[PDB]
Design an enzyme around this catalytic site. Structure first.
Site, short mmCIF file in Angstrom:
data_model
loop_
_atom_site.label_atom_id
_atom_site.label_comp_id
_atom_site.label_asym_id
_atom_site.label_seq_id
_atom_site.Cartn_x
_atom_site.Cartn_y
_atom_site.Cartn_z
N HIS A 85 76.56 -6.35 127.25
CA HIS A 85 77.31 -6.60 126.11
C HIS A 85 76.67 -6.10 124.91
O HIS A 85 75.98 -6.81 124.09
CB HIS A 85 77.91 -8.04 125.71
CG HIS A 85 78.78 -8.49 126.79
ND1 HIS A 85 80.14 -8.53 126.60
CD2 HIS A 85 78.55 -8.85 128.11
CE1 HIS A 85 80.68 -8.82 127.94
NE2 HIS A 85 79.73 -9.14 128.77
N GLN B 195 87.89 -10.51 125.26
CA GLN B 195 87.15 -11.82 125.51
C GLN B 195 88.01 -12.75 125.18
O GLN B 195 87.68 -13.86 126.04
CB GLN B 195 85.94 -11.62 124.34
CG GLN B 195 85.31 -13.12 124.43
CD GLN B 195 84.36 -13.38 125.42
OE1 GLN B 195 82.90 -12.97 125.56
NE2 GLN B 195 84.78 -13.70 126.55
N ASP C 283 73.78 -8.11 132.22
CA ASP C 283 74.79 -8.84 131.47
C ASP C 283 74.64 -8.93 129.71
O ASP C 283 75.21 -8.62 128.93
CB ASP C 283 75.20 -10.08 131.86
CG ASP C 283 76.53 -10.58 131.55
OD1 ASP C 283 76.76 -11.71 132.21
OD2 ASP C 283 77.31 -10.08 130.76
N1 LIG Z 1 78.47 -13.82 130.53
P1 LIG Z 1 79.42 -12.92 130.04
O1 LIG Z 1 79.55 -11.74 131.00
C1 LIG Z 1 78.81 -12.45 128.29
C2 LIG Z 1 79.97 -12.47 127.61
N2 LIG Z 1 81.31 -12.90 127.64
C3 LIG Z 1 81.90 -13.40 128.87
O2 LIG Z 1 82.95 -13.88 129.15
N3 LIG Z 1 81.15 -13.43 130.03
ZN LIG Z 2 79.81 -9.72 130.70
#
Ligand SMILES: N[P@]1(=O)C=CNC(=O)N1
Ligand SMILES: [Zn+2]
Ligand SMILES: C[C@H](O)COCC(COC[C@@H](C)O)(COC[C@@H](C)O)COC[C@@H](C)O
Ligand SMILES: C[C@H](O)COCC(COC[C@@H](C)O)(COC[C@@H](C)O)COC[C@@H](C)O
Ligand SMILES: N[P@]1(=O)C=CNC(=O)N1
Ligand SMILES: [Zn+2]
Ligand SMILES: [Zn+2]
Ligand SMILES: [Zn+2]
EC number: 3.5.4.1
Lengths: 422, 422
Positions: free
Chosen positions: B60, B153, B310
């Site tokens: 991210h 998100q 991640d």
């Molecule tokens: N742990 P991750 O993959 C990172 C940001 N947002 C999420 O929903 N999950």
């Molecule tokens: Zn993620």
């Protein structure tokens, strides 16, 4: 013609207070310099606690006082309760319903309850109890503001003409639309039933109160649909999910995800400790789950939750005197809300939180509000709860509508001594 | 102008190898008879291991480097992470995003990563980060081939204008369509959101990468919809399910049934060991589950699975140097892939398997391919992983774009001695 309440304690306030009445309303609330002497047109609170009236956010007045008729609920389960009720529902008459409802309503008046939401079973082509209860609502109005929920006990989709009967109950005047998604034949009927419930509430502009996931099944998640529909329609304040006992059995990760929605949606929750402890955990051997919804966590998250009595001497509960302090006592124990402050604040779960659940506007000890209030012979919420005190006076529109002369206990030791349990 | 890489080891091959370069491509790979002397226009691999570049299939870049701003994730959960990010997302600017993304991208270049898939939060009416990241993709292109996932998100159906924002992100140029079905308000929204995701991917001809069942909830089974939709559309190779941590908690019979579909569908899987071990198991007391998806079983079944980092110093992970060998180390331990051969072959989980996940065509040490390759100062995959080696050289299009002079350790005993940890 009461003009004043004197010598009153108020929760979270120091010393004594005088409450001025005018035209059935509270005109002013003023601190006292000391204990005041009784005067004409004054009601002496005797240094007791003054709070707005108790609320019963969840009761079944159509089933009340029918336990054992014609048969008893042997297993003590929700499901056998419904079977026993179906047998009794076949014997219902107009006079039978009104007589039993009034019996319990009188106990409620005596217990300082001035606001009551009753569910009435509308899985009945004759709508006998619903129509009788609409009459009772008008008859009891001088003493209790009664809300009627059109409650489709046997399902909306799973009972013949269920949806049409539910809509007819609203047309006739029911204040709240009910549902029972976990009792529908399938999960799909359960979800669809909630869509129909919300559509009806929007069509007639009514409240919603769902019997939601009242089952020890970790897969019963109808609450997320109730909250999502409320959020979509922007109608959170008007929506209640009752029981949600399945939440007691959810895994923690799902519950955490869900709580975001529950908070955003603004819906209300009712837990019914006396009945929940009795009906839940019945399919466990040992250990046995408690089965009450996540009250402690809801409170920590600022989610509105409150306590109802649910049933009084009926197929689901063989006891009761319709007493909210007794309900609260059970709830604090089973939910382990046993810190001093939690117990002291417990009155909120049977007053202010419940008033919010019923969407009440004219409620609370404040100038401009109707003079609806009760007086407990207790120093604070903790004392009232610990000693399970009766209601000393119930005042409605500035008039006394109930009073209890407290019991007097004496022990005869070397001399007679009065016992106050303090 | 590099013409040759000399003295190179290749996984699963004996002896040393010479790699000939021509016009930014690999022209030939020939066995050496022995150690060759350094010549002009040659890069000496020094008997190190030569592999295609590391891949980061899941990061991210819009959230990177924001940990603690304005608040820390106290509980270390996915759900609080999202709340903390929402606070930071409100403070985002164009320059802020580009500066932080480039900070992490530079670490990645230094770590031999030449292919990166970044998720960018498009639950944002301004699409600030998405538009900035489209620019970064062009800016970093000489060093990293960056894929952008339009990642909703806060949900497609559960966020205002979510679907329109997701489609606008694709119109603007996002390479991949994302989703987050377990974070939608209801299971029904979750399933419907995947239908919308697949419809968008087919409309714009894009890849799909879903944050799928990232939750310790045995009832979270959105992965079966992702795989079924992929199978129906014949688009398996273009589809990735990230996390699938709920699979860690499924019963075995359902998992067995599911695996038939997963294999037939041909979809890819990403596990994120550093973040998964931190965020999962947070609602357990003891014992506590590991919470990584069924990597070992996937590998046994010939299902493509790979590892991502991640998060790097953000609301979901307070650590990181964007190092894939470190990710691999964690993954091998938590997934118990600790046989000698499994560890030695571990490089595949951060190279070839990840390249397949990103649907890459020009990848691998083979004649005709672009000269994109890295050199590890290690004898084989096991050695590289055990000693957590840096990248000695990173070569892209036949040019060196990063180099590390390895640390030098000496102990002073009866005489000075060099320590290589071998
Ligand atoms: N742990 P991750 O993959 C990172 C940001 N947002 C999420 O929903 N999950
Ligand atoms: Zn993620
Ligand atoms: C003790 C209890 O169970 C019965 O009380 C009689 C009562 C009479 O209703 C009168 C009405 C307002 O027109 C209610 O209580 C008295 C009033 C003054 O509050 C209800 O009786 C129901 C029969 C008539 O089916
Ligand atoms: C260290 C790091 O965080 C900042 O580097 C500056 C950088 C400048 O971008 C130039 C662009 C290609 O036009 C990228 O790194 C240098 C180049 C040569 O690769 C990115 O800065 C972002 C600001 C301008 O918002
Ligand atoms: N326990 P309760 O609220 C009472 C009657 N009928 C129900 O379905 N549930
Ligand atoms: Zn009548
Ligand atoms: Zn009920
Ligand atoms: Zn720009």
């Amino acid at each position: 013609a009461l003009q004043t309440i004197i010598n009153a304690r108020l929760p979270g306030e120091e010393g004594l207070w005088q409450i001025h009445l005018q035209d059935g309303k509270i005109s002013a609330i003023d601190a006292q310099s000391g204990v005041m002497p009784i005067t004409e047109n004054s009601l002496d609170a005797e240094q007791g606690l003054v709070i707005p009236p108790f609320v019963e956010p969840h009761i079944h007045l159509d089933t009340t006082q029918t336990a054992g008729q014609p048969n008893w609920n042997q297993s003590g389960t929700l499901f056998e309760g419904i079977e026993r009720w179906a047998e009794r529902k076949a014997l219902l008459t107009h006079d039978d319903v009104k007589q039993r409802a009034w019996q319990t309503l009188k106990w409620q008046i005596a217990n300082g309850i001035q606001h009551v939401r009753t569910h009435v079973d509308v899985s009945d082509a004759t709508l006998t109890a619903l129509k009788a209860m609409l009459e009772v609502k008008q008859e009891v109005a001088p003493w209790i503001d009664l809300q009627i929920v059109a409650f489709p006990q046997e399902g909306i989709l799973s009972y013949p003409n269920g949806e049409a009967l539910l809509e007819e109950a609203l047309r006739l005047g029911a204040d709240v639309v009910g549902a029972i998604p976990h009792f529908e034949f399938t999960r799909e009927y359960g979800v669809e039933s909630l869509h129909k419930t919300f559509a009806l509430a929007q069509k007639y502009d009514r409240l919603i109160d769902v019997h939601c996931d009242e089952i020890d099944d970790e897969q019963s998640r109808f609450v997320e649909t109730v909250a999502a529909l409320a959020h979509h329609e922007g109608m959170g304040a008007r929506v209640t999910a009752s029981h949600t006992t399945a939440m007691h059995s959810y895994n923690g990760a799902y519950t955490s995800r869900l709580f975001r929605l529950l908070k955003m949606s603004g819906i209300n929750f009712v837990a019914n400790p006396l009945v929940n402890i009795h009906l839940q955990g019945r399919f466990d051997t040992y250990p046995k789950r408690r089965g009450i919804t996540r009250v402690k966590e809801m409170l920590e998250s600022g989610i509105n939750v409150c306590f109802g009595h649910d049933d009084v001497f009926d197929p689901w509960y063989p006891l009761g005197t319709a007493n909210m302090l007794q309900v609260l006592h059970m709830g604090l124990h089973v939910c382990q809300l046993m810190g001093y402050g939690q117990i002291n604040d417990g009155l909120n779960l049977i007053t202010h939180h419940s008033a919010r659940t019923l969407n009440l506007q004219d409620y609370g000890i404040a100038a401009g509000n109707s003079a609806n209030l009760i007086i407990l012979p207790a120093e604070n919420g903790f004392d009232a709860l610990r000693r399970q005190v009766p209601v000393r006076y119930s005042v409605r529109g500035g008039k006394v509508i109930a009073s209890t002369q407290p019991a007097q206990t004496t022990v005869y030791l070397e001399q007679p001594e009065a016992i106050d349990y303090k």
